[PDB]
């Protein structure tokens, strides 16, 4: 790691990078940070207020020697500028700065293209990376965040299994391949995903993550990482391209993926990690403006509330500007439809609200959700964009961990049961999630003001899969009993108010063999196992039918808390069950009333129904012995949905 020199403070009039006054002096507001390319000329602008000198170093190859070093001119508000009056396309560059007594060299933080492993900025005309027809790219319609069904997927997981039937395994283009087949001829890849009826694919880190995680020059050797180690925020990851050495390839191929998903009726959500960088000492931010872009404690050490070594200082204006302009780059250049903010509680509220505001000016249907966990940091508590402050973050969804733990049990105490597995006293936790996490009434309240702020899930890339958690918490159960519990958990997600979220492979009871944190586990742990999918085609169809049920019934997708409080009623139900009605054509539902039973009791039950008319079975008939319209006879763990028709 070596030495960080925070600068000769005579350069900044005696004002240290750590002084609050620093943020009055050097707040550059221009829209031209980075390289602005033209065949006529390329203009460079670097923000580096503490540097006493700045150079652009030009390279001809991603690994070669400098062919030219050009001094930059000190400009306004801590920036440096340089105009090169030639066609610079095909060249590579870095910045070299003198900060204090030492010289540092770094990629452009505003890099839009890079060489292999992201060690040099690539000069490229981005118009030459657009797919044929990109100008006519249109998004599938979306009337409400509550109409989304999110499918969380890793680009490598999707296709790397040897029987995936996909040619470009591990690559962006692997998800553009249509008509791919797996074991016994089952659909795989894109056709499998569109066939489920999900609406959004949420992609694990597709920005450029560090060479320490996946070495893009050694892709012929085994490799795997989720990618939560950011290196270049504004350029795609090289290992998901067919040629990481061609700066244009990863850009064109990601746009091809997005174009194809849109044409097949899918939207794309990008997992973004603005809360930390791969290495606080080696990142370009620290080489160019040490002390500014990352958060420091009072003793001038890194704040490490991410447990990754560092936090980004989103609350400082130039970093706030950086994050916002990065998001807008992904929206405008790549047509991205949403963002999932990793450790959103490490980002400040003003930054999150300005992001939401800027996106609403472009397209309010663009999704913003995040991990709103309550986590310590030097960022003051009232500024953290987390669940405790959700009242201050309108329109931003947060993962509902209360609902998650109530349904499947404590994710950190592996053997602890929850609602689905026969634990005691989880019914109110499930009810709170059914109501969308809102202040429904009495003890049924969580953090959400509106149901658009609550993302419901029982599986994601983190922690055990739902199947693996059920296994660890039900040692006395058979796999057939656990499969019923698994199906019930998925049903709860898809019939609760709010935004439903599925982990890729949940539809076929994805297992990681009990691995809790698979971020760098081999592909054998992390792949979408298309053999298991072929053995679980009935479970896949069950998930497809659940998703179809939610789409057929807008009563499950109410947009406002007032509607939920006026139409959702919890009914009398015994322990280890939850029952509710959605009354009076809620949300424009075609049926007059719905009744939903979550039955975690494996035995036989006779239940009293509210006398609202001639109930009929709509879902889960396999659990129903009799319906008297009022009394319901059920047996076995699972969901039952009844309706009173119009
Ligand atoms: O269409 C009217 C239908 O609507 C509702 O059914 C829903 C189910 O309650 C729900 O479970 C889901 O059904 C899935 C099923 O869970 C999944 O396993 C798979 O089903 C397989 C069966 O495993 C298999 O035994 C066989 O099913 C037979 C069934 O035994 C027989 O009684 C009769 O109904 O014919 C069926 C086949 O046509 O094959 C199926 C298909 O592989 O896939 C199912 C569909 O995704 O979703 C249903 C709605 O789609 C009502 O609850 C039910 O009463 C009504 O009959
Ligand atoms: O690289 C240093 C860092 O690596 C490891 O941290 C990884 C976590 O173990 C891994 O689970 C993942 O954590 C992220 C979650 O997946 C994400 O959804 C959210 O909760 O934020 C987490 C951080 O962004 O990725 C990280 C980073 O690769 C290792 O465990 C750390 O101790 C180590 O400092
Ligand atoms: O040391 C880094 C850490 O990274 C990962 O931990 C993540 C959890 O796996 C993930 O569930 C989430 O934890 C939050 C809970 O879900 C929530 O209910 C509440 O308890 O807040 C938690 C965060 O404080 O996020 C963490 C942190 O990224 C990885 O899985 C760990 O193994 C690893 O230790
Ligand atoms: Ca990379
Ligand atoms: Ca909104
Ligand atoms: Cl759908
Ligand atoms: Cl690869
Ligand atoms: Cl907090
Ligand atoms: Cl328990
Ligand atoms: Cl809560
Ligand atoms: Cl058990
Ligand atoms: Cl019976
Ligand atoms: Cl009616």
PDB file of C-alpha atoms and ligand atoms in Angstrom, residues 415-418 423 473, ligand 9:
ATOM      1  CA  UNK A 415     -31.000 -23.672  12.737  1.00  0.00           C
ATOM      2  CA  UNK A 416     -33.664 -21.201  13.935  1.00  0.00           C
ATOM      3  CA  UNK A 417     -37.123 -21.891  12.478  1.00  0.00           C
ATOM      4  CA  UNK A 418     -39.511 -19.281  11.136  1.00  0.00           C
ATOM      5  CA  UNK A 423     -41.689 -21.901  14.537  1.00  0.00           C
ATOM      6  CA  UNK A 473     -33.616 -25.384  10.389  1.00  0.00           C
TER       7      UNK A 473
HETATM    8 CL1  LIG B   9     -36.252 -22.915  16.243  1.00  0.00          CL
END
